[PDB]
Each structure stands twice: as structure tokens, then as C-alpha cells.
Write a protein that binds this ligand. Sequence first.
Ligand code: K
Ligand code: K
Ligand code: K
Ligand code: K
Ligand code: K
Ligand code: K
Ligand code: K
Ligand code: K
Ligand code: K
Ligand code: K
Ligand code: MG
Ligand code: MG
Ligand code: MG
Length: 1322
Amino acid sequence: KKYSIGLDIGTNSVGWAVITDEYKVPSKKFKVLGNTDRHSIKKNLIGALLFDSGETAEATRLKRTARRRYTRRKNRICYLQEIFSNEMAKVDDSFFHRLEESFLVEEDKKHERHPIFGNIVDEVAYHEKYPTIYHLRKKLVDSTDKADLRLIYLALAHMIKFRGHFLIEGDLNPDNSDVDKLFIQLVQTYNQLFEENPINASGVDAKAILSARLSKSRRLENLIAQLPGEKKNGLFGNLIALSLGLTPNFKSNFDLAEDAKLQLSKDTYDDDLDNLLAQIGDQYADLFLAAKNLSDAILLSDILRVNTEITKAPLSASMIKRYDEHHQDLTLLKALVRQQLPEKYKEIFFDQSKNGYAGYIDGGASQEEFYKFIKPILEKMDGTEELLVKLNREDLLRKQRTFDNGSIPHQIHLGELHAILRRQEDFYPFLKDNREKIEKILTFRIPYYVGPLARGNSRFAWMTRKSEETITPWNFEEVVDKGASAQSFIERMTNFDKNLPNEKVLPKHSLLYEYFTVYNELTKVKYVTEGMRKPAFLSGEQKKAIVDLLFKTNRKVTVKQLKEDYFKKIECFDSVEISGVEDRFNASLGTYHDLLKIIKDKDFLDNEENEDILEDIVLTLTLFEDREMIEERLKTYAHLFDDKVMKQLKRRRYTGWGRLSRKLINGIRDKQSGKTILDFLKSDGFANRNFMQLIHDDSLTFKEDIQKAQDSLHEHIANLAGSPAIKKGILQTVKVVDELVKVMGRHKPENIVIEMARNSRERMKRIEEGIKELGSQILKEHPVENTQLQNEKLYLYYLQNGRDMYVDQELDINRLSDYDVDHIVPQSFLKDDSIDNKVLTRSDKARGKSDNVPSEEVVKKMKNYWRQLLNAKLITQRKFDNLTKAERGGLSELDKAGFIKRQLVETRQITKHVAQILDSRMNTKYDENDKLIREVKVITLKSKLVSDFRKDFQFYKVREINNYHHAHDAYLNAVVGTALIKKYPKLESEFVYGATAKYFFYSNIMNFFKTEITLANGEIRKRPLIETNGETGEIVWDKGRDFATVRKVLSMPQVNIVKKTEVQTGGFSKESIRPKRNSDKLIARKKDWDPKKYGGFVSPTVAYSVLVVAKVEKGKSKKLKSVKELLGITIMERSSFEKNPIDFLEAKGYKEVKKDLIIKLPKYSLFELENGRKRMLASARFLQKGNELALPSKYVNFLYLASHYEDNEQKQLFVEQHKHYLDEIIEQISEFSKRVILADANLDKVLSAYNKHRDKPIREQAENIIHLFTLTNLGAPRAFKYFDTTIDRKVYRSTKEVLDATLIHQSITGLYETRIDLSQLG
RNA sequence: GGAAAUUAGGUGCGCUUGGCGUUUUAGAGCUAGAAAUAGCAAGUUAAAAUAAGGCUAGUCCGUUAUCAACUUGAAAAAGUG
DNA sequence: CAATACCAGCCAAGCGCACCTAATTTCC
DNA sequence: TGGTATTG
Ligand SMILES: [K+]
Ligand SMILES: [K+]
Ligand SMILES: [K+]
Ligand SMILES: [K+]
Ligand SMILES: [K+]
Ligand SMILES: [K+]
Ligand SMILES: [K+]
Ligand SMILES: [K+]
Ligand SMILES: [K+]
Ligand SMILES: [K+]
Ligand SMILES: [Mg+2]
Ligand SMILES: [Mg+2]
Ligand SMILES: [Mg+2]
């Protein structure tokens, strides 16, 4: 028989259904394997496959990086100890052993328990002299006395183990001694430039304000308040913002047309400043130079809070300052709370459970939790003034190892390490020879373009070696081929030219590539004037004239420039009209002008003989990012340019790659003409063919040479784009189809209809940068937590700066419930309910008529406000374009036509691949003309088609009832998809893989299903009972016969819902290391670390369970007792268990294991017990509900309408008349629950909670009935609420009862089963 | 259906790094007590581990993808109603 | 044994390639 | 949601 397949692909489900030509779902009898008395079973061909979400590889990648870094940090300490090895032996032959075994208890230690000196009196004296490592670090930097070689190592090891970041390039030499002299010098250089209006320097404690422990924004406002007759946005105000590390805009200071934003820390500053200085004049050079000088002394003011005159260890001295002020303020807080609050002294300084100082030091209270807990206490008391001040600056009772230590650059640690090495160098000869070696251990960093230092056993590595020997931080340059590695790092990822697959694409900024883009757009421009009869192309001589006169003069060429600078002069046309380009050209010779600024030799860039060398330069500047390697590769061309040009050309760099190769655009040639593709773009007579025309024109050879130059299924899907979560459904969809084909006797279906379904940390950063760019005060006036931005109106409120944007007024946070959320494009036209199409106005009517885009008067009144929000990234350019669409004519007849086509035709590329994959598997033969025979039509639909169909014919959907809706959607997809194609065969082009009239057609396309149709024109249309194809006469829809088939299909209680059994993978257990306890549930973190002494991990993840049938020793006699039980194999144990299952189980305590009866039971293994009650294995000690509550169809659509409430009044009487359905639905739940759920207490608690709210409105009661299905849903028990009664989940921890039940093995469709009566074992 | 360019936004894969946290130990608690306890003192730091571990022994690899059952397969995938 | 209670590693930087969406121009 | 511990 003939049939079709309906498919519904989702991130966690795949619906499927088989239908016949009468739109019926066939029922069959399938063989039942196993050892039960059942030999077959009747099954309908409809169901859904359910599966856990497929995971992305990010978390696995982050963990693989953390593993590499812990291995290399250990190797750094190992490098340092190897250097210290011989000389440390002469001082203390077991010092490094005590450091290694410091974690062990004294019982397990092989050496004395005090690590540093090996005895107690020396150990106590050390901590008295150096309470923190920073005390020792500072002493070793400043003192000249010879120091103990052990203490030297401990200081150097602490700087190498925690070495600080690498975000700043170059050397750093902290020098804060001249902040005062640098500030006055800045105001001195300002006064020589602005002798008209100068600033007075005296009386300004510029050091204190600019080195204060406040924000860079706060320090700026304080300085300007000190300076009379100035402003934060004045020139000197923006200059100070620069020196402090902010990004102020100098555009308004100099009457500039573009922005002049500068930041001293960005590497573009040296060229941004030159861009600005060329705009405003060279006499302002010292002004920005002095701003740079003052910035160097206050650069690390937050990290170094001690003046660098006293010590060469400002970082350590700042940590000692933290310690001393902690000590002083701790003694004061104690004596204070002792005198004024003696009742609470126990809670603050002894209770670890509370967030006091005890929980701050010994408990789990963080610095923030400590401040929040104690701040009310300090206020109540007197004399806590300075401490409340120290608290609000986050500088009270501070530790030295804190979360905010990420500011410290590695140069700072290196400075103290270099100083220690410079002191003890004189006393220890080996520290002299290895001073650079030790410094290298701290500074060395594997470049990202090198990757893992592997030797042929890493699938991630690409590194190439010069010499086959071990790589260390000292021989890295000599052993690693950084050049070959930095090249492979890119060429392993770059695309090949699809036209010539053996060729790599050019760099996006290649000069040849931009000539191509310019000539490809230029060669299709047409111009017309008054005299000529018809618009003509530009000849070859005209295009070179335009490229030489305009494109090689200005960055971007406008038609305005084209009109007024070529035709107006060279042709003298006083009025010409241009065709093929609006406003301006898209292409541009950006690289040409870039190099022209660097070399100034315009003749050299125009000298065509330098084509190859100029391409090699752009390739080097794109291939590499290390400016040292760039210089080395540009050294072969160093003779052609002066040394200053080489210094500029080396810093300039590009990124990005094109889509075409050099050989395609300017290499291969036509046989007859001998011209390459670029040559045709320059001159093609009067045809002026472009790239697409050239490689498709049979007149020349390009089309053939491209055709001349021209993988598993699992591979093919994994290589697609899109989320790995949706990819999981694609592969399962294919596997589901393959089985259905085998079910139907290996006959292929007529049609396959497929359908595919459609944070706060990123939101808070967007708001933060958005307001800060605009400089508004709404964050200061209204501060929000990042989690609170999950409110749609409140998130919009901050995107709109707390201001209505359809009209010019402010908004109030307190009246959020009274505003409106109108969609820019009406939701009827476009199914876009994202932030890109939402808005927060006061009234939806203040938009104008909802027929179109917001009114032209609205756009004209709010145009400037929307461009401000764009430049603050608070709205996207598309959102701005849509809002401003009214000035561009708004929506048209063509615009409105394209929207409803997008509502029915799926255009997503990911959905096309699924259609391409299925079509490739089904249609494989060829006809007489070697054209593919299309046996199976693959139709693609969107959700709105079946969604409207459900809502038009009252085939309503309630997701919470059960999982049947996944399969029902697949059935309706096959029905609607096949009926639409059989009715309108002309639509196969638009629905099968491989203006006003179009709008009216698509908007009424589904009308053929109805009998009485009301149109927007007011026309009431009547259609016959049976529908047919006009040409063929074949019957398509029988409205008196085929609708009844749908309800018969949707009401079928037996549908095949299958949860995909999966072996669990991932982390072994939870990550938290628990303290020592006397339980044996803990897992050792190392082999010899018994958790009873050292603690360990809890909650291991079971990979899968195994049915174990054997004997166990019982009692002191060790008599063998037979057992049958369920053993959970953890992820950690899995490899050893599968290597030798008998020895693994025998080590667990099982003897004489029946090996042939071991059953691998992965998660979600299905069991049937009594009365069809089903359980699913959540683990070895946890069960999930295994039954689906098939609710009758009459209750489903009644639950829909009663919960949701034209003929809305007619459906209301149905709800009111059938108000008795509630006690029937409840009876349905109770009957189902008492049979399969077995939650007696939870059930009568719902029954009691139900009978309490019987006086509630029917709409309100119908909503909470939907919540009750959480009690009966498939899967894990979950807590739900009924009105205000919260009923907790009833869990199934006893897995004993499954060991005597029937194990059900299901195929992917669930049609093929193997049932095993486990009660027959043991 | 597809290509290149332009503008804007987003996802994926991979590499190189920073700072916390946690765990055990070290940092002599004192006095009065038989002792439980009571009173005071003290607290900020370090080492080491950070998936158990593996052989291929690398400054490498170890949490993604893929998996009903049976009969064959190293595996993918095939064969069976 | 079953019910009940509570628990779960986090934050941050830089670099590169590839791909998707939606709008425009020129084309196959 | 599945593990651990307490509770009962
Ligand atoms: K010992
Ligand atoms: K002022
Ligand atoms: K702690
Ligand atoms: K703490
Ligand atoms: K710490
Ligand atoms: K344009
Ligand atoms: K580059
Ligand atoms: K998983
Ligand atoms: K997996
Ligand atoms: K299965
Ligand atoms: Mg780290
Ligand atoms: Mg390790
Ligand atoms: Mg730490």
C-alpha cells in the first residue's frame, strides 16, 4: 500500500506518524521477542522519540584547558626545584620532601611535620617574623643580608606559582614618586597651548585624588570639582579621563565631524592619536604626550597603594598594609563590641555558622557576605566612623589572597622576583647563572598559535618542531618552529576556493581581492544622459579612469562624487543619472589607501610590477599576529622602504579571509581571449560581464575549468552548522525514517513532511556599556541586579534609558505595569517576538494606525532619539531600520506579500539540510537523461500552518497532559502537507526540496479545508463538501469524512512514546571536596588519600546499572546466600568493569556470578509491573514514572478553552454547559494515579486541595487542573502547586520491585520489542 | 535554489592565560580545672591536590558527539519480525 | 525499610578560523 | 533531579 511520513524535529523530541491516502494511521501486529508468553502486539504507526538534550563541547573544552594549565603550573615549580636541587641538598636534604608531603597527616608523613625548617621552634619563629608570605617577599627584596636558601625558594616559588596576568605588553617599571610633578607639567603644557584660558595647579592634591581607592569615574569628578571654571567634558577634563584609563570622546572639544575616542591601553592609540593630530594640528602633540607621562605613574595606583620610594616591592608592601590595617581594625572592633555589645561578641568572633568574623576567617562567609552581615552592627555603635568608611570602599579587614587580585600584572611579580634574585645572587653562585632561567619560568607563555607541545598523540595539536628533543621554557625558540606552527595554526582552519577546491582563498584585505570587488560592482553600473537613447555600460577606459581618479583618491566613492567628479568634469555632463549603485559604492580600495599612508609611494602601489610582492606583504600581515614574526618576514623587503616605513608597516595588521582564491580571479585564463577573470571585469567590450556571468557563460572556458576542479552520514550531520542540540534530532530523524521504511516492507513513502521547532550576565554588560556610552544617570538613579533584568518591560526600560520612545516623555519604574509593549512590525505580519522587534511606549495607540510601521510623524519626532540608542548599542541597526521604515515609504504591497510567504515557506538553512539529507537517501536512481528520479517528495512546513489548522478545527493542544502532542503534530503535518500538495500541485516548487495577487493567494491558501469562509473583504465564501484537484479530478479532501479521521487518530490511546535509553557520561561525581567523615560514600581524590583522613568527593554519577545474579557471603560464617540485585556502575568504574566484568564484580563482593545473565541497564530502561504500571530507571536507586495518561479528546479541548477564555461567546456556552467535566477529569487523574502513580498521600492532598477551591471561577480552576498532570507526567517526579497548595514530589528510591518485573527493550520507533520476565531469574 | 560584495547581529570549534574557592597539614593557644566545661587570647599566611588516572611517557591524553535487544562485527554499520 | 531534608565550582582575559540570521546591490 | 544523610 502507499503511504506518507510526517516528521516533527525538536531539541528533545522527534514526532513521527505514518498515514495512508485516506489520511488514516495504520495499525499492525509486530513480533514480540523474549521469554514472555506474549508473541505479538498490536501497534499504531504513530509516536514520538524523546531524548535528553545533546550537549555542546564548550564545558569539555574549558576543562581540557584547566587540565593543561594545572600540569604546566606544576612543571614550573618542578623547573625551579631542579635548579635548586644540588645546592638545597647541602642546606636541607629533605626540604623538598616535606613540601611534597605537606598534605599528609602526621601518621603518614615520612619526615617531620613542620615543612620549612623541620622543627617546631624554628617554624614558630618564622611565622612570628613573617606573618604572611608578603612579609618575607618584601624582606628578601629590600634587605642586603644573606638569606636562608629555603626562604629564598619559598618566595620565588610563590611568585612563579601565582604569577599574574599577561594583558599588558612590554616592560613595566613602577615609579609613583613624580605624580605631583607630572600633573603640574600636564597643566603646564596645557597653559602654553591655551595661554588665553589656563588652569591653576596649586592647592590640588592630585596624587591623593588620582591615587585614591575609588573608581576612575569617581576620581575624575573629584578633580574637576577642585578645578574652578572647568568641566568633566572640557578638554582638560577629557584629558584627565585619558590618563586614568577611560575612553573619552574628543570630538566635541575640537568641532569634529567624527568621533575622537582615545584609550591609552588600546594598541590602536598610536595610530588613533595620529589620526586625531592630523585633524586638529601638530602643536597639540605634547598635550597628549604629557597625558601619557602622567598615566605611567598612576597606572597601578589600585594595585600599588604604597609609594615606591621606600621599597622595591610595592605590591608586597601593599599586602603588608592590608595586613596591618586588618590587625589594627580587628583590635578596635573587638574592644568596641566588648564595651558596647558584649552580648553579641560570641556570634561575631566564635560562630562559624554566622557570617561574622569567625565565619569570615574559618567559616564559609565571603568578604561581601561578611560586610553585609556586619555593616548594621557598626552603624549602631559609636566610634565606628572610619570603619564604616573603610567598609564602603571594600577595604576593611582585607585578606591578601582575594578575588580582586586579578588586576596584578606579571611584570609586578617579576620585579620582586628579579630583586630577590639580585640580592641573594651575591651570596649564592648558582642564582647568578640561572637568574635569566628563573625569570624565564615566570615570564614564558606558550603562544596561542602554537598549541599543545604534543608528539603525535594529540588530536588538537598542530605544532611543528625544528629539533626532536624535549621543549623547555629556555629552548622554546630553538626547538619549536614558531613560523611553521603559526602558519599551520591558520591554514588548518581557512576555507578553500569552492570553485577551485585545491586553492586557498585570498586574504580579505588583499589588494587583488579588493580590485576584484571594485571592478565586479563597477562593471555593472549603467549611466544615461539626455543625449543618449539608452543607458550604457562604462567602457574599460572609463572604469580605469574612475578607479584612478576616485577610488584611488577617496576611501569610499559616492555616486555624488561619481556624478560631480567624473561626468561633471571628464564628460562635462551637468546632470547624469546612475544605475546599479545607490548612495555609494559598497566596495572600496581600503588596503590601497592603508598602505598609501604608510609608504607614501603612490607610484609604487600603482606600479603593476609589484603585484606579487604587495600580495605577499598583505598575506604576512594577515597570517601573523606576533609583530616580531611579522618584522622577520617583512625583512626581505626592507631594502625597498626606509626604516620608519618598516616601523609603520610592521605594526599595521589585518584579519579575515575572502571567499575566492588568487588563481580564480587573476590566474586561470580563457582559451580564446587569454584574459583572466579580473581582466574581463576591467574590460569586456560592451557585454561588461561580472563574476557570476563569467563563470557560467558557455562562450569561454571558465565554466568548464571550474567543473573540472570539483564522508559518512554521522560525519555529515556533525559538520553542519547550528546547535549540537538540534543536530541530535536530525540524526534520530533519519534513523526513525529508516525503521519506518523497513516496517512498511521496504517500500518508500509517497511524501515525507518535515517540521522543525523554532543570558543575564550578557544582558547586564549590555546595559552597563549602553548607559555609560550615553552618559545617562539612570543606573545611578536606579540600580538593578543582573538577575532582575529577566523582566521584559524592565529590560526594555533600561534599553530605552527609562524613557518612552514612541513619544517624548520619561517613564517611571514604579508604573511598569501600565505601559505597553508594542511590536515595531505588527506581530501578524512577522513572527518576531525578540528584543529586535519590541518597544516600551506608554500607549500602543501612540504609534499611529497598526496597519503599518509607526507613523511618519512619530519617526520624524523620534528620529534623533533612535540614532542615539543605536550608537550606544542599546538597539541594533535592524531595529533602527525597522522603526525608521516609515520615512522610506513604510510597508508596501510587495513588502506585505513577502511576510506571509515567510510564514508558510521554511527558509532556514538547517531545515533545508534535513530535507537535502532525506531526499538524498530516498531518491537515488536516474532516468534516460541522467536526471534524478524523484520517487519521494520531501515537503517542508512551518509551525503556523498546523497551528492555525488546530485552532481552526478545534484540534486543540495541551502540552502538559502528556507527550502525545509531539506525535499528533507529526500526524497533522503529514495530513496538511500531503493535502496541500495534492490540492495545489503547482506548489511543489515552493514546498518540495529541489504583489497584491501573491499576497491574496498565500493568505487564503488554506481556505479549501473549510466550508463557510469569512473573508476580510466581507465576502462569505461557500465550498462543497468534497474538494478535488481541478486538473486531475482526484479527491483531495472530504469534509464529511476526513475530519472524522483526524479525531479518530488524535483520540487513539496507544501511541508509541519512547524515551531513548542512554549511558551517562561526563564528570565522575560532584566537584566539591567534602571534609573528612566516617562514611564510606566518599571518594578519594588521590589513590593513597583515604577520605576518612583527607575527605573527598560525593555523589558519583552512575553510567549504567547491571543486573547482578550471584551469591554473597552472609554472617560471620561467610555462608553463601543467593541474591538478585541492581548494581550501579559509576563512570569512574566503567572502564575497569568492562575490561574484566567477573573480577570487578568479585571484588565488589559477589561470588559465582552468572555471567550470561548480566543485563546492561542504561538510564531510562523501561519496566512493566502490574496493571500496565511502568517504571523507568533513573539510576540504581531511583525510578521515574513510565506511563502516559491518555486523556480523552473531549476533556483536552475543554481544558484548552476553559483555561484560555468572533464566536468567542459561542464557545463560552460549551464551557458553561460542560462544567461537569471537571469532576470527570479529576476522576480520570485519581483513577490513573491510583493505578500507576501510587502517591496516596499526594493524591488525597490534591483531592482535598481540589474540593477547597470549588467555588473559584472556572477559568481559574481549569488552569490549576493543568498543574495536576505534573503528578502523572512521564519521567521524574516533580513538585507542582495547586492554587496556593504546594505538593512536593513523591519519589521512588526503592528499585527492588523492578528486579521481578518485565524488562522492555524498544527499538527507536518502539514498534519492535523484546520483553524479558525478570521474575524467571534468580 | 545559488554566488560575491556591503551593513548589523548571533552561534560553533580550537588554542593560550589570570584570580578565587575547597580539601589535609603547618602557623606551640593560655589559665583554671580530674574531667565535661568556663573565662580570655588568637584569627589575614603557606605547602599540596584540583577529575581516580593512562601509555603512547608528550610541558601529551582523560567530562562533546555516538549507543534497544538478539545473531555477526575491533568499530561504524550490517543481518533478523 | 520508607519519608523527609538539603545539597550541587565560580569568576575573568586574549587570539583565530568557520558558520547562521536579515536587509541592500549586482548576477546565475 | 539524583545523591546523601537524617529521620521514623
Ligand atoms: K614520621
Ligand atoms: K568645576
Ligand atoms: K573555610
Ligand atoms: K570564609
Ligand atoms: K585562601
Ligand atoms: K550602496
Ligand atoms: K593578523
Ligand atoms: K548527559
Ligand atoms: K554522551
Ligand atoms: K531504544
Ligand atoms: Mg589557576
Ligand atoms: Mg594530575
Ligand atoms: Mg588558594
